[PDB]
Amino acid sequence: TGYDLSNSVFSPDGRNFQVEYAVKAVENGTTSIGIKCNDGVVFAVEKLITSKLLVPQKNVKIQVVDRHIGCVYSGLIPDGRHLVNRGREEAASFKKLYKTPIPIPAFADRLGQYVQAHTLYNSVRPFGVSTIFGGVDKNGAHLYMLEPSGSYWGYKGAATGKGRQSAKAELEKLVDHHPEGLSAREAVKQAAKIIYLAHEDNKEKDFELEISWCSLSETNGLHKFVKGDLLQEAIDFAQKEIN
């Protein structure tokens, strides 16, 4: 034994235990999700209200990269911010040289190679976040989810955090019941419901819902936060479904 004391060490199984321990930090975090719709993507996250003293709507979790990509993550929040900062540098250098905004698959690999690089040495720690991200490019909508190992795939729907099992089951129903697809406005409503349903794993404290979206028709392919009336409409829809 001792294989789990140092990053980048293969166990006799062929496993990197330090990466697996980073996953435990992700599983300990709040629930975040992503839904791929007809012409875009919708991101939503559970924000635990630890105290009444938290200013509502102020501690924003979802982050924009460039102007067309949204990023949300569960686990160690600072690690997620560090990853987004890198992503923003990657997107800037891509656009600088190639003019066009970074395509979502291209951006996915940039984050992927960076996270994977933190599993190659014992002088760094793996990322304590799973990141759900995506947006609209020239080939359409894309949704990705990226793990501490650097592993990522494309998704129809994605979920991570403490209530991921609940969320995944809900996402799987949507995929089965809508083979033709989901509209952006439908996806926002469904995202609100799934976070509310996934909040049962975090039922002790109450929470605040945060939603964002990129849609070719609804936002001109730009990342925007769901605010005001549209947000309240989604909250009402969600509250109606849990009762």
Partner 1 sequence: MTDRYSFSLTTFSPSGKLGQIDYALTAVKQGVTSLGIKATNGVVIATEKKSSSPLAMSETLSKVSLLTPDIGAVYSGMGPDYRVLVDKSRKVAHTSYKRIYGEYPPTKLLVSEVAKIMQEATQSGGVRPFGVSLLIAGHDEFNGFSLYQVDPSGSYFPWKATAIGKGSVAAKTFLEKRWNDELELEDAIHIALLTLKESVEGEFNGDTIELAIIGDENPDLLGYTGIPTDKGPRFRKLTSQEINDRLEAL
Partner 2 sequence: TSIMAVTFKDGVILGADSRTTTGAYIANRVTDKLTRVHDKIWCCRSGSAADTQAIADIVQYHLELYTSQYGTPSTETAASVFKELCYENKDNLTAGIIVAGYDDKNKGEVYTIPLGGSVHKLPYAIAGSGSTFIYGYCDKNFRENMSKEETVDFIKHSLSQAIKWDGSSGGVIRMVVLTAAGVERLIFYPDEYEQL
Partner 3 sequence: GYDRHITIFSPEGRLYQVEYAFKATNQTNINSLAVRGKDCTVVISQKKVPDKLLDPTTVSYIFCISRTIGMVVNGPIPDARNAALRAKAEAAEFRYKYGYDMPCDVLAKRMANLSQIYTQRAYMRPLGVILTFVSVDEELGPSIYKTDPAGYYVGYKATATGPKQQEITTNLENHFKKSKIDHINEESWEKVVEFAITHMIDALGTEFSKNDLEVGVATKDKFFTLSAENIEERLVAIAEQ
Burial class (CB in 10 A: 0-12, 13-18, 19+), 47: buried
In angstroms, the CA 206 to CA 46 distance is: 10
As measured in angstroms, the least distance from the Cβ of 236 to partner 3 is 27
How many other CB atoms sit within 10 Å of the CB of residue 109?
15
In angstroms, the CA 166 to CA 80 distance is: 23
Which of 53, 55, 96, 123 binds partner 1 (CB under 8 A)? It is 123
Residues between 77 and 116 that touch partner 1 (CB under 8 A):
none
Q: Is 30 a catalytic residue?
A: yes
In angstroms, the CA 240 to CA 227 distance is: 19
Catalytically annotated residue among 1, 30, 31, 100: 30
How many other CB atoms sit within 10 Å of the CB of residue 202?
16
As measured in angstroms, the least distance from the Cβ of 235 to partner 2 is 39
Told to check if 156 binds partner 3 by CB under 8 A, we report yes
Q: Is 238:187 a contact under the CB 8 Å cutoff?
A: no
Told to check if 121 binds partner 1 by CB under 8 A, we report yes
As measured in angstroms, the least distance from the Cβ of 5 to partner 3 is 8
Stretch that binds partner 3, among 54-62, 147-155, 195-203, 223-231 (CB under 8 A): 147-155
Residues in contact with partner 1 by CB under 8 A are: 117, 120-121, 123-124
User: Catalytic residues, which ones?
Assistant: 30
